[PDB]
Amino acid sequence: XPFXNQYVAL
Amino acid sequence: XPFXNQYVAL
User: Fold this and answer.
1) CA gap B6, B1 in Å, rounded
2) What are phi and psi of A9, to 5 degrees?
3) Cross-chain residue pair A7–B6, CB shorter than 8 Å
4) CB contacts < 8 Å between A and B, how many?
5) Torsion angle, CA of A8/A5/B7/B5, rounded to 10 degrees?
6) Beta-strand (E) ranges in chain A?
7) From its phi and psi, is residue A9 left (phi > 0), alpha (psi between -120 and 50) or beta?
8) Contact at 8 Å (CB) between A10 and B8?
9) Does B7 sit within 8 Å of A1, measured CB to CB?
10) Smallest CA–CA separation between A10 and chain B, in Å?
């Protein structure tokens, strides 16, 4: 979702 | 990484 980065996103 | 979508990305 709106958390993480462009590599690991949730 | 280069898998998933813009919401759940690995």
Assistant:
1) 11
2) -125, 135
3) no
4) 17
5) -60
6) none
7) beta
8) yes
9) yes
10) 5
| Smallest CA–CA distance from A7 into chain B, residue | B1
Residue at A3: amino acid letter = F
Single-letter residue type at A1 = X
- Binary contact (A8, B9; C-beta < 8 A): yes
Asked whether the beta carbons of A9 and B8 are under 8 A apart, the reply is: yes
Minimal Cα–Cα distance from A1 to chain B, Å?
A: 5
Question: What's at B5, amino acid-wise?
Answer: N
